């Protein structure tokens, strides 16, 4: 579904991880809308970010993010056992279409 | 004009003539056409093209202009205050075109 992504990045309690979202020219590069979505395993996703680097109500500081030109990346700062989930990147997709990322799981040992 | 608002006309005693007013300060205005139009070219006879509006990509919206109401009310009040002088101590109003 386009938007190649680090399909599985492992970790442990305590450290920070950067999870990326690779766009070609238009989807991420043209304008500045990106968002990340957390599926609890086998369940419906929910919400943590809008406008790349801001948060809604009900989200902590750890679920940060930033733009890097032709690639946007979530920054799960201080990964813990709660992060057993998959963080889906979605963004503007050129024309008037919204594209969705390929997914990336985060596993905590 | 560097000094306060100026009012100009040939003969204010005549109602036909058009008044021209210079404001002491500008008021910011913005206009937009949010529809993301597209252009296509159709060729006619020799290498003699003609462009026309294609299909509206995305959603449709109405072109609009934005004027800051704070500055606009202040400026309209000042112009009324100035116009009250040449016409002796009457009320002044503004109506549609």
């Amino acid at each position, epitope marked *: *579904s386009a938007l190649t992504q680090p399909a599985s990045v492992s970790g442990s309690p305590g450290q920070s991880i950067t999870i990326s979202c690779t766009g070609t020219k238009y989807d991420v590069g043209s304008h500045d*809308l*990106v*968002s990340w*979505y957390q599926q609890y395993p086998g*369940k*419906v*996703p*929910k*919400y943590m970010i*809008y406008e790349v680097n801001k948060r*809604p109500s009900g989200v902590s500081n750890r679920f940060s993010g930033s733009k890097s030109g032709n690639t946007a990346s979530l920054t799960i700062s201080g990964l813990r056992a709660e992060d057993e989930a*998959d963080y*889906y990147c*979605c*963004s*503007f*997709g050129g024309s*008037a*279409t*919204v*594209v*969705c*990322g*390929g*997914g990336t799981k985060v596993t905590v040992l | 004009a560097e000094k306060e608002i100026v009012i100009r006309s040939e003969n204010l005693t005549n109602n036909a003539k058009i008044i021209i007013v210079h404001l002491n300060t500008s008021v910011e205005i913005v206009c937009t056409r*949010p*529809g*993301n139009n597209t252009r296509k070219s159709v060729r006619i006879g020799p290498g003699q093209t003609f462009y026309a509006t294609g299909d509206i990509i*995305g*959603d*449709i*919206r*109405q072109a*609009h202009c934005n004027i800051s109401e704070k500055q606009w009310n202040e400026t309209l009040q000042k112009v009324g205050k100035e116009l009250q002088k040449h016409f002796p101590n009457k009320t002044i109003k503004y109506e549609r075109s």
Partner: nanobody, 126 residues
């Protein structure tokens, strides 16, 4: 504040058209876009098409154009989906979501927020 509560399980055979729907509640229906999302088992979300509820204009991703038809329902709020030329490869859970904010001054259809979700409908085709 917002709850979409869609339909439960649905059953169809290949080649038909499926009526998937979502029942918004807790907010004025004609003030938010409706974005439809696929989730086939094992892969990530794939976007289907945004719906304007005030005016019936719609759009669809290029991988689904023609096959997907949708209509609004302002009386009840339950927007409808129609997936013609159905295939067993479409054995995927279909989602319903509230998009951005509709207004008279700037196009906000592609704003990919997706604030509130539905609970996933297990549609299997064979």
């Amino acid at each position: 504040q917002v709850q979409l509560v869609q339909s439960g399980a649905q059953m169809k055979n290949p080649g038909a058209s499926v009526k998937v729907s979502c029942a918004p509640s807790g907010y004025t229906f004609t003030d938010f876009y409706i974005h439809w999302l696929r989730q086939a088992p094992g892969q990530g979300l794939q976007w289907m098409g945004w719906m304007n509820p005030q005016t019936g204009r719609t759009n669809t991703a290029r991988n689904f154009q023609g096959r997907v038809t949708m209509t609004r329902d302002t009386s009840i709020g339950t927007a409808y989906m129609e997936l013609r030329s159905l295939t067993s490869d479409d054995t995927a859970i279909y989602y319903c979501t509230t998009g951005g904010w509709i207004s008279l001054y700037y196009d906000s259809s592609y704003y990919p927020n997706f604030d509130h979700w539905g609970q996933g409908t297990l549609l299997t085709v064979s």
